[PDB]
PDB file of all heavy atoms in Angstrom:
ATOM      1  N   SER P 262       0.848  -1.164   0.002  1.00  0.00           N
ATOM      2  CA  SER P 262      -0.038   0.089   0.005  1.00  0.00           C
ATOM      3  C   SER P 262       0.900   1.208   0.083  1.00  0.00           C
ATOM      4  O   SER P 262       1.790   1.428   0.890  1.00  0.00           O
ATOM      5  CB  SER P 262      -0.913  -0.110   1.302  1.00  0.00           C
ATOM      6  OG  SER P 262      -1.782  -1.281   1.154  1.00  0.00           O
ATOM      7  N   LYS P 263       0.810   2.111  -1.078  1.00  0.00           N
ATOM      8  CA  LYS P 263       1.660   3.145  -1.244  1.00  0.00           C
ATOM      9  C   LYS P 263       0.917   4.452  -1.584  1.00  0.00           C
ATOM     10  O   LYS P 263      -0.183   4.426  -2.286  1.00  0.00           O
ATOM     11  CB  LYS P 263       2.628   2.852  -2.365  1.00  0.00           C
ATOM     12  CG  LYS P 263       3.709   2.024  -1.941  1.00  0.00           C
ATOM     13  CD  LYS P 263       4.627   1.451  -2.992  1.00  0.00           C
ATOM     14  CE  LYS P 263       3.828   0.941  -4.169  1.00  0.00           C
ATOM     15  NZ  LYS P 263       4.634   0.084  -5.113  1.00  0.00           N
ATOM     16  N   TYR P 264       1.497   5.617  -1.292  1.00  0.00           N
ATOM     17  CA  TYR P 264       0.976   6.853  -1.811  1.00  0.00           C
ATOM     18  C   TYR P 264       1.761   7.445  -2.734  1.00  0.00           C
ATOM     19  O   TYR P 264       2.990   7.154  -2.770  1.00  0.00           O
ATOM     20  CB  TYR P 264       0.523   7.805  -0.574  1.00  0.00           C
ATOM     21  CG  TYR P 264       1.712   8.429   0.049  1.00  0.00           C
ATOM     22  CD1 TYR P 264       2.471   9.503  -0.554  1.00  0.00           C
ATOM     23  CD2 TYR P 264       2.185   8.041   1.390  1.00  0.00           C
ATOM     24  CE1 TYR P 264       3.499  10.104   0.171  1.00  0.00           C
ATOM     25  CE2 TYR P 264       3.105   8.696   2.020  1.00  0.00           C
ATOM     26  CZ  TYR P 264       3.885   9.720   1.395  1.00  0.00           C
ATOM     27  OH  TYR P 264       4.836  10.167   2.161  1.00  0.00           O
ATOM     28  N   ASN P 265       1.333   8.389  -3.557  1.00  0.00           N
ATOM     29  CA  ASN P 265       1.962   8.857  -4.692  1.00  0.00           C
ATOM     30  C   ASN P 265       2.008  10.417  -4.667  1.00  0.00           C
ATOM     31  O   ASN P 265       0.973  10.983  -4.720  1.00  0.00           O
ATOM     32  CB  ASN P 265       1.265   8.315  -5.894  1.00  0.00           C
ATOM     33  CG  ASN P 265       1.679   8.951  -7.260  1.00  0.00           C
ATOM     34  OD1 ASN P 265       0.851   9.150  -8.118  1.00  0.00           O
ATOM     35  ND2 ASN P 265       2.953   9.255  -7.338  1.00  0.00           N
ATOM     36  N   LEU P 266       3.193  10.943  -4.468  1.00  0.00           N
ATOM     37  CA  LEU P 266       3.430  12.274  -4.241  1.00  0.00           C
ATOM     38  C   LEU P 266       4.446  12.916  -5.162  1.00  0.00           C
ATOM     39  O   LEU P 266       5.610  12.451  -5.190  1.00  0.00           O
ATOM     40  CB  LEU P 266       3.879  12.495  -2.830  1.00  0.00           C
ATOM     41  CG  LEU P 266       3.859  13.966  -2.312  1.00  0.00           C
ATOM     42  CD1 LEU P 266       2.369  14.513  -2.082  1.00  0.00           C
ATOM     43  CD2 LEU P 266       4.762  14.139  -1.051  1.00  0.00           C
ATOM     44  N   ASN P 267       3.979  13.772  -6.072  1.00  0.00           N
ATOM     45  CA  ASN P 267       4.812  14.352  -7.127  1.00  0.00           C
ATOM     46  C   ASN P 267       5.522  13.243  -7.839  1.00  0.00           C
ATOM     47  O   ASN P 267       6.791  13.313  -7.846  1.00  0.00           O
ATOM     48  CB  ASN P 267       5.791  15.382  -6.453  1.00  0.00           C
ATOM     49  CG  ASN P 267       6.565  16.261  -7.426  1.00  0.00           C
ATOM     50  OD1 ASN P 267       7.624  16.778  -7.077  1.00  0.00           O
ATOM     51  ND2 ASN P 267       6.066  16.289  -8.655  1.00  0.00           N
ATOM     52  N   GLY P 268       4.910  12.242  -8.348  1.00  0.00           N
ATOM     53  CA  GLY P 268       5.583  11.195  -9.090  1.00  0.00           C
ATOM     54  C   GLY P 268       6.416  10.227  -8.354  1.00  0.00           C
ATOM     55  O   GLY P 268       7.024   9.316  -8.910  1.00  0.00           O
ATOM     56  N   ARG P 269       6.528  10.507  -6.999  1.00  0.00           N
ATOM     57  CA  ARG P 269       7.245   9.627  -6.114  1.00  0.00           C
ATOM     58  C   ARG P 269       6.433   8.754  -5.123  1.00  0.00           C
ATOM     59  O   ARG P 269       5.612   9.289  -4.438  1.00  0.00           O
ATOM     60  CB  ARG P 269       8.137  10.430  -5.375  1.00  0.00           C
ATOM     61  CG  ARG P 269       9.535  10.383  -5.674  1.00  0.00           C
ATOM     62  CD  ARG P 269      10.412  11.598  -5.439  1.00  0.00           C
ATOM     63  NE  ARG P 269      10.387  12.180  -4.032  1.00  0.00           N
ATOM     64  CZ  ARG P 269      10.107  13.377  -3.731  1.00  0.00           C
ATOM     65  NH1 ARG P 269       9.852  14.262  -4.576  1.00  0.00           N
ATOM     66  NH2 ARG P 269      10.000  13.652  -2.416  1.00  0.00           N
ATOM     67  N   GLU P 270       6.657   7.402  -5.227  1.00  0.00           N
ATOM     68  CA  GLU P 270       5.943   6.523  -4.330  1.00  0.00           C
ATOM     69  C   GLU P 270       6.625   6.319  -2.920  1.00  0.00           C
ATOM     70  O   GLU P 270       7.775   6.417  -2.716  1.00  0.00           O
ATOM     71  CB  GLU P 270       5.761   5.236  -5.027  1.00  0.00           C
ATOM     72  CG  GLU P 270       4.641   5.149  -6.070  1.00  0.00           C
ATOM     73  CD  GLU P 270       4.323   3.716  -6.442  1.00  0.00           C
ATOM     74  OE1 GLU P 270       5.166   2.698  -6.221  1.00  0.00           O
ATOM     75  OE2 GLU P 270       3.202   3.410  -6.820  1.00  0.00           O
ATOM     76  N   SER P 271       5.704   6.126  -1.958  1.00  0.00           N
ATOM     77  CA  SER P 271       6.190   6.085  -0.599  1.00  0.00           C
ATOM     78  C   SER P 271       5.169   5.015   0.054  1.00  0.00           C
ATOM     79  O   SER P 271       3.911   5.046  -0.203  1.00  0.00           O
ATOM     80  CB  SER P 271       5.933   7.436   0.093  1.00  0.00           C
ATOM     81  OG  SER P 271       6.815   7.573   1.140  1.00  0.00           O
ATOM     82  N   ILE P 272       5.794   4.092   0.577  1.00  0.00           N
ATOM     83  CA  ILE P 272       4.964   3.018   1.339  1.00  0.00           C
ATOM     84  C   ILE P 272       4.287   3.632   2.550  1.00  0.00           C
ATOM     85  O   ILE P 272       4.787   4.493   3.226  1.00  0.00           O
ATOM     86  CB  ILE P 272       5.936   1.901   2.052  1.00  0.00           C
ATOM     87  CG1 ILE P 272       6.550   1.115   0.942  1.00  0.00           C
ATOM     88  CG2 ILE P 272       5.177   0.947   2.827  1.00  0.00           C
ATOM     89  CD1 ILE P 272       6.951  -0.269   1.326  1.00  0.00           C
ATOM     90  N   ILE P 273       2.940   3.293   2.675  1.00  0.00           N
ATOM     91  CA  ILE P 273       2.256   3.831   3.776  1.00  0.00           C
ATOM     92  C   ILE P 273       2.604   2.910   4.870  1.00  0.00           C
ATOM     93  O   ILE P 273       2.345   1.720   4.782  1.00  0.00           O
ATOM     94  CB  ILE P 273       0.662   3.818   3.467  1.00  0.00           C
ATOM     95  CG1 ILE P 273       0.342   4.958   2.381  1.00  0.00           C
ATOM     96  CG2 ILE P 273      -0.110   4.093   4.784  1.00  0.00           C
ATOM     97  CD1 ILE P 273      -0.757   4.538   1.494  1.00  0.00           C
ATOM     98  N   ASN P 274       3.259   3.479   5.790  1.00  0.00           N
ATOM     99  CA  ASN P 274       3.752   2.675   6.969  1.00  0.00           C
ATOM    100  C   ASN P 274       3.842   3.581   8.199  1.00  0.00           C
ATOM    101  O   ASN P 274       4.680   4.447   8.122  1.00  0.00           O
ATOM    102  CB  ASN P 274       4.961   1.977   6.736  1.00  0.00           C
ATOM    103  CG  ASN P 274       5.506   1.183   7.948  1.00  0.00           C
ATOM    104  OD1 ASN P 274       4.935   1.145   9.000  1.00  0.00           O
ATOM    105  ND2 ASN P 274       6.498   0.312   7.717  1.00  0.00           N
ATOM    106  N   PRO P 275       3.248   3.278   9.295  1.00  0.00           N
ATOM    107  CA  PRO P 275       2.169   2.207   9.613  1.00  0.00           C
ATOM    108  C   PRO P 275       0.826   2.477   9.081  1.00  0.00           C
ATOM    109  O   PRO P 275      -0.050   1.516   9.014  1.00  0.00           O
ATOM    110  CB  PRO P 275       2.188   2.149  11.049  1.00  0.00           C
ATOM    111  CG  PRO P 275       2.589   3.598  11.603  1.00  0.00           C
ATOM    112  CD  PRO P 275       3.687   4.015  10.584  1.00  0.00           C
ATOM    113  N   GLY P 276       0.480   3.677   8.615  1.00  0.00           N
ATOM    114  CA  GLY P 276      -0.792   3.929   8.007  1.00  0.00           C
ATOM    115  C   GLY P 276      -1.829   3.985   8.997  1.00  0.00           C
ATOM    116  O   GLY P 276      -1.657   3.918  10.206  1.00  0.00           O
ATOM    117  N   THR P 277      -3.167   4.106   8.553  1.00  0.00           N
ATOM    118  CA  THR P 277      -4.340   4.341   9.258  1.00  0.00           C
ATOM    119  C   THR P 277      -4.274   3.376  10.530  1.00  0.00           C
ATOM    120  O   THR P 277      -3.836   2.237  10.431  1.00  0.00           O
ATOM    121  CB  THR P 277      -5.539   4.079   8.299  1.00  0.00           C
ATOM    122  OG1 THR P 277      -5.533   5.128   7.400  1.00  0.00           O
ATOM    123  CG2 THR P 277      -6.881   4.070   9.082  1.00  0.00           C
ATOM    124  N   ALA P 278      -4.725   3.844  11.660  1.00  0.00           N
ATOM    125  CA  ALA P 278      -4.885   2.947  12.871  1.00  0.00           C
ATOM    126  C   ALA P 278      -5.903   1.879  12.558  1.00  0.00           C
ATOM    127  O   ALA P 278      -7.120   1.992  12.480  1.00  0.00           O
ATOM    128  CB  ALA P 278      -5.244   3.663  14.127  1.00  0.00           C
ATOM    129  N   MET P 279      -5.341   0.645  12.417  1.00  0.00           N
ATOM    130  CA  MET P 279      -6.267  -0.498  12.180  1.00  0.00           C
ATOM    131  C   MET P 279      -5.779  -1.784  13.015  1.00  0.00           C
ATOM    132  O   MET P 279      -4.666  -1.926  13.378  1.00  0.00           O
ATOM    133  CB  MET P 279      -6.315  -0.853  10.676  1.00  0.00           C
ATOM    134  CG  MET P 279      -6.766   0.229   9.877  1.00  0.00           C
ATOM    135  SD  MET P 279      -7.076  -0.408   8.170  1.00  0.00           S
ATOM    136  CE  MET P 279      -5.421  -0.425   7.708  1.00  0.00           C
ATOM    137  N   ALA P 280      -6.740  -2.660  13.329  1.00  0.00           N
ATOM    138  CA  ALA P 280      -6.479  -3.820  14.077  1.00  0.00           C
ATOM    139  C   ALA P 280      -5.543  -4.728  13.292  1.00  0.00           C
ATOM    140  O   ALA P 280      -5.899  -5.039  12.112  1.00  0.00           O
ATOM    141  CB  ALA P 280      -7.646  -4.552  14.521  1.00  0.00           C
ATOM    142  N   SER P 281      -4.515  -5.290  13.892  1.00  0.00           N
ATOM    143  CA  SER P 281      -3.480  -6.188  13.224  1.00  0.00           C
ATOM    144  C   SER P 281      -4.005  -7.514  12.636  1.00  0.00           C
ATOM    145  O   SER P 281      -3.540  -8.004  11.601  1.00  0.00           O
ATOM    146  CB  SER P 281      -2.330  -6.425  14.118  1.00  0.00           C
ATOM    147  OG  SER P 281      -1.886  -5.148  14.571  1.00  0.00           O
ATOM    148  N   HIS P 282      -4.945  -8.151  13.431  1.00  0.00           N
ATOM    149  CA  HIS P 282      -5.539  -9.331  12.909  1.00  0.00           C
ATOM    150  C   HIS P 282      -6.817  -9.553  13.708  1.00  0.00           C
ATOM    151  O   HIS P 282      -7.024  -9.124  14.778  1.00  0.00           O
ATOM    152  CB  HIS P 282      -4.541 -10.539  13.232  1.00  0.00           C
ATOM    153  CG  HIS P 282      -4.109 -10.619  14.578  1.00  0.00           C
ATOM    154  ND1 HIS P 282      -4.752 -11.208  15.616  1.00  0.00           N
ATOM    155  CD2 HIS P 282      -3.005 -10.216  15.250  1.00  0.00           C
ATOM    156  CE1 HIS P 282      -4.134 -11.175  16.742  1.00  0.00           C
ATOM    157  NE2 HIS P 282      -3.039 -10.537  16.538  1.00  0.00           N
ATOM    158  N   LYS P 283      -7.808 -10.273  13.054  1.00  0.00           N
ATOM    159  CA  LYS P 283      -8.998 -10.653  13.719  1.00  0.00           C
ATOM    160  C   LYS P 283      -8.697 -11.801  14.692  1.00  0.00           C
ATOM    161  O   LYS P 283      -7.564 -12.345  14.788  1.00  0.00           O
ATOM    162  CB  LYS P 283     -10.149 -11.000  12.808  1.00  0.00           C
ATOM    163  CG  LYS P 283      -9.769 -11.971  11.728  1.00  0.00           C
ATOM    164  CD  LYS P 283     -11.031 -12.975  11.495  1.00  0.00           C
ATOM    165  CE  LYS P 283     -11.154 -13.344  10.040  1.00  0.00           C
ATOM    166  NZ  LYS P 283      -9.860 -13.319   9.201  1.00  0.00           N
ATOM    167  N   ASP P 284      -9.747 -12.131  15.601  1.00  0.00           N
ATOM    168  CA  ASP P 284      -9.651 -13.206  16.574  1.00  0.00           C
ATOM    169  C   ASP P 284      -8.906 -14.409  16.044  1.00  0.00           C
ATOM    170  O   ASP P 284      -9.175 -14.898  14.920  1.00  0.00           O
ATOM    171  CB  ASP P 284     -10.890 -13.592  16.992  1.00  0.00           C
ATOM    172  CG  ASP P 284     -11.507 -12.600  18.028  1.00  0.00           C
ATOM    173  OD1 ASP P 284     -10.708 -11.727  18.599  1.00  0.00           O
ATOM    174  OD2 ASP P 284     -12.698 -12.657  18.331  1.00  0.00           O
ATOM    175  N   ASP P 285      -8.024 -15.025  16.845  1.00  0.00           N
ATOM    176  CA  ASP P 285      -7.394 -16.240  16.598  1.00  0.00           C
ATOM    177  C   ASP P 285      -6.372 -16.277  15.458  1.00  0.00           C
ATOM    178  O   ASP P 285      -6.035 -17.268  15.006  1.00  0.00           O
ATOM    179  CB  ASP P 285      -8.392 -17.293  16.209  1.00  0.00           C
ATOM    180  CG  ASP P 285      -9.232 -17.746  17.336  1.00  0.00           C
ATOM    181  OD1 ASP P 285      -8.645 -17.856  18.517  1.00  0.00           O
ATOM    182  OD2 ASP P 285     -10.447 -18.207  17.150  1.00  0.00           O
ATOM    183  N   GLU P 286      -5.825 -15.140  15.043  1.00  0.00           N
ATOM    184  CA  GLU P 286      -5.099 -15.121  13.891  1.00  0.00           C
ATOM    185  C   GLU P 286      -3.790 -14.276  14.115  1.00  0.00           C
ATOM    186  O   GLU P 286      -3.327 -13.615  13.270  1.00  0.00           O
ATOM    187  CB  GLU P 286      -5.725 -14.575  12.649  1.00  0.00           C
ATOM    188  CG  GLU P 286      -6.768 -15.473  12.091  1.00  0.00           C
ATOM    189  CD  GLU P 286      -7.418 -15.164  10.816  1.00  0.00           C
ATOM    190  OE1 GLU P 286      -7.194 -13.891  10.430  1.00  0.00           O
ATOM    191  OE2 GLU P 286      -8.164 -15.825  10.171  1.00  0.00           O
ATOM    192  N   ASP P 287      -3.203 -14.585  15.365  1.00  0.00           N
ATOM    193  CA  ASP P 287      -2.020 -13.786  15.718  1.00  0.00           C
ATOM    194  C   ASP P 287      -0.894 -13.944  14.879  1.00  0.00           C
ATOM    195  O   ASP P 287       0.149 -13.309  15.052  1.00  0.00           O
ATOM    196  CB  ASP P 287      -1.698 -13.995  17.146  1.00  0.00           C
ATOM    197  CG  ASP P 287      -1.030 -12.633  17.718  1.00  0.00           C
ATOM    198  OD1 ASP P 287      -1.720 -11.535  17.910  1.00  0.00           O
ATOM    199  OD2 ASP P 287       0.153 -12.721  18.074  1.00  0.00           O
ATOM    200  N   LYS P 288      -0.923 -14.963  13.977  1.00  0.00           N
ATOM    201  CA  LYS P 288       0.248 -15.243  13.078  1.00  0.00           C
ATOM    202  C   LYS P 288       0.411 -14.397  11.927  1.00  0.00           C
ATOM    203  O   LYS P 288       1.485 -14.298  11.314  1.00  0.00           O
ATOM    204  CB  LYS P 288       0.201 -16.738  12.762  1.00  0.00           C
ATOM    205  CG  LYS P 288      -0.735 -17.038  11.613  1.00  0.00           C
ATOM    206  CD  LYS P 288      -0.385 -18.402  11.075  1.00  0.00           C
ATOM    207  CE  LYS P 288      -1.008 -18.566   9.697  1.00  0.00           C
ATOM    208  NZ  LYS P 288      -1.616 -19.860   9.395  1.00  0.00           N
ATOM    209  N   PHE P 289      -0.662 -13.541  11.520  1.00  0.00           N
ATOM    210  CA  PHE P 289      -0.701 -12.704  10.447  1.00  0.00           C
ATOM    211  C   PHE P 289      -0.438 -11.175  10.921  1.00  0.00           C
ATOM    212  O   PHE P 289      -0.756 -10.890  12.023  1.00  0.00           O
ATOM    213  CB  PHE P 289      -1.999 -12.647   9.686  1.00  0.00           C
ATOM    214  CG  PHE P 289      -2.214 -13.994   8.991  1.00  0.00           C
ATOM    215  CD1 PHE P 289      -3.399 -14.871   9.210  1.00  0.00           C
ATOM    216  CD2 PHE P 289      -1.441 -14.181   7.891  1.00  0.00           C
ATOM    217  CE1 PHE P 289      -3.623 -15.982   8.554  1.00  0.00           C
ATOM    218  CE2 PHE P 289      -1.701 -15.529   7.109  1.00  0.00           C
ATOM    219  CZ  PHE P 289      -2.749 -16.382   7.562  1.00  0.00           C
ATOM    220  N   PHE P 290       0.043 -10.304   9.999  1.00  0.00           N
ATOM    221  CA  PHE P 290       0.245  -8.872  10.385  1.00  0.00           C
ATOM    222  C   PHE P 290       0.219  -8.126   8.995  1.00  0.00           C
ATOM    223  O   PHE P 290       0.621  -8.684   7.965  1.00  0.00           O
ATOM    224  CB  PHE P 290       1.476  -8.791  11.054  1.00  0.00           C
ATOM    225  CG  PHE P 290       2.764  -9.072  10.291  1.00  0.00           C
ATOM    226  CD1 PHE P 290       3.413  -8.047   9.576  1.00  0.00           C
ATOM    227  CD2 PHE P 290       3.164 -10.329  10.329  1.00  0.00           C
ATOM    228  CE1 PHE P 290       4.561  -8.357   8.858  1.00  0.00           C
ATOM    229  CE2 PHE P 290       4.386 -10.673   9.578  1.00  0.00           C
ATOM    230  CZ  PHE P 290       5.076  -9.733   8.892  1.00  0.00           C
ATOM    231  N   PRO P 291      -0.108  -6.830   9.086  1.00  0.00           N
ATOM    232  CA  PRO P 291      -0.121  -6.123   7.903  1.00  0.00           C
ATOM    233  C   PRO P 291       1.354  -5.938   7.498  1.00  0.00           C
ATOM    234  O   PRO P 291       2.149  -5.742   8.348  1.00  0.00           O
ATOM    235  CB  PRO P 291      -0.743  -4.707   8.242  1.00  0.00           C
ATOM    236  CG  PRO P 291      -1.405  -4.991   9.582  1.00  0.00           C
ATOM    237  CD  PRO P 291      -0.545  -6.137  10.215  1.00  0.00           C
ATOM    238  N   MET P 292       1.570  -6.168   6.208  1.00  0.00           N
ATOM    239  CA  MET P 292       2.953  -5.951   5.613  1.00  0.00           C
ATOM    240  C   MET P 292       3.665  -4.647   6.010  1.00  0.00           C
ATOM    241  O   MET P 292       4.888  -4.661   6.380  1.00  0.00           O
ATOM    242  CB  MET P 292       2.838  -5.941   4.084  1.00  0.00           C
ATOM    243  CG  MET P 292       4.226  -6.085   3.463  1.00  0.00           C
ATOM    244  SD  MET P 292       4.190  -6.822   1.821  1.00  0.00           S
ATOM    245  CE  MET P 292       3.470  -5.550   0.828  1.00  0.00           C
ATOM    246  N   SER P 293       2.989  -3.511   6.182  1.00  0.00           N
ATOM    247  CA  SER P 293       3.681  -2.276   6.672  1.00  0.00           C
ATOM    248  C   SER P 293       2.640  -1.477   7.549  1.00  0.00           C
ATOM    249  O   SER P 293       2.703  -0.280   7.641  1.00  0.00           O
ATOM    250  CB  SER P 293       4.123  -1.414   5.473  1.00  0.00           C
ATOM    251  OG  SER P 293       3.036  -1.096   4.623  1.00  0.00           O
ATOM    252  N   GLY P 294       1.839  -2.218   8.373  1.00  0.00           N
ATOM    253  CA  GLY P 294       0.779  -1.529   9.258  1.00  0.00           C
ATOM    254  C   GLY P 294       1.020  -1.798  10.776  1.00  0.00           C
ATOM    255  O   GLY P 294       0.203  -1.543  11.647  1.00  0.00           O
ATOM    256  N   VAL P 295       2.203  -2.269  11.055  1.00  0.00           N
ATOM    257  CA  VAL P 295       2.632  -2.381  12.539  1.00  0.00           C
ATOM    258  C   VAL P 295       4.052  -1.827  12.797  1.00  0.00           C
ATOM    259  O   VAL P 295       4.911  -1.894  11.944  1.00  0.00           O
ATOM    260  CB  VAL P 295       2.584  -3.813  12.989  1.00  0.00           C
ATOM    261  CG1 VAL P 295       1.290  -4.385  13.262  1.00  0.00           C
ATOM    262  CG2 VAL P 295       3.480  -4.638  12.004  1.00  0.00           C
ATOM    263  N   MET P 296       4.023  -1.241  14.008  1.00  0.00           N
ATOM    264  CA  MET P 296       5.291  -0.708  14.353  1.00  0.00           C
ATOM    265  C   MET P 296       6.223  -1.879  14.677  1.00  0.00           C
ATOM    266  O   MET P 296       5.793  -2.868  15.240  1.00  0.00           O
ATOM    267  CB  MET P 296       5.114   0.171  15.611  1.00  0.00           C
ATOM    268  CG  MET P 296       4.278   1.319  15.379  1.00  0.00           C
ATOM    269  SD  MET P 296       5.227   2.621  14.433  1.00  0.00           S
ATOM    270  CE  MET P 296       6.299   3.133  15.825  1.00  0.00           C
ATOM    271  N   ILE P 297       7.471  -1.833  14.211  1.00  0.00           N
ATOM    272  CA  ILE P 297       8.428  -3.006  14.426  1.00  0.00           C
ATOM    273  C   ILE P 297       9.750  -2.600  15.063  1.00  0.00           C
ATOM    274  O   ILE P 297      10.509  -1.855  14.419  1.00  0.00           O
ATOM    275  CB  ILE P 297       8.632  -3.792  13.218  1.00  0.00           C
ATOM    276  CG1 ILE P 297       7.330  -4.183  12.572  1.00  0.00           C
ATOM    277  CG2 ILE P 297       9.546  -4.949  13.508  1.00  0.00           C
ATOM    278  CD1 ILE P 297       7.452  -4.924  11.237  1.00  0.00           C
ATOM    279  N   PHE P 298       9.988  -3.003  16.196  1.00  0.00           N
ATOM    280  CA  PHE P 298      11.284  -2.741  16.938  1.00  0.00           C
ATOM    281  C   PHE P 298      12.461  -3.730  16.617  1.00  0.00           C
ATOM    282  O   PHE P 298      12.195  -5.005  16.560  1.00  0.00           O
ATOM    283  CB  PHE P 298      11.242  -2.450  18.391  1.00  0.00           C
ATOM    284  CG  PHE P 298      10.172  -1.387  18.632  1.00  0.00           C
ATOM    285  CD1 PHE P 298       8.890  -1.584  18.841  1.00  0.00           C
ATOM    286  CD2 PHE P 298      10.577  -0.045  18.709  1.00  0.00           C
ATOM    287  CE1 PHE P 298       7.968  -0.694  19.005  1.00  0.00           C
ATOM    288  CE2 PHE P 298       9.705   0.956  18.918  1.00  0.00           C
ATOM    289  CZ  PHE P 298       8.339   0.582  19.001  1.00  0.00           C
TER     290      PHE P 298
END
């Protein structure tokens, strides 16, 4: 998921506040929607 600014692409990360996974699915995560240390 990218935004496009003056012909330049930028990954939306972390992007809109959204839940990382529905119930019982803690093994999945948004490609660029979680903060990662």
Side-chain angles (χ1 to χ4, degrees):
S262 295
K263 286 171 308 199
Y264 72 73
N265 167 217
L266 192 73
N267 191 199
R269 253 153 53 230
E270 282 192 337
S271 206
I272 294 206
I273 290 147
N274 179 355
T277 297
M279 295 191 289
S281 305
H282 54 82
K283 50 142 150 21
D284 282 343
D285 285 329
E286 286 186 352
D287 207 72
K288 81 169 200 217
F289 291 119
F290 64 94
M292 196 154 72
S293 59
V295 281
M296 295 285 287
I297 306 172
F298 304 88

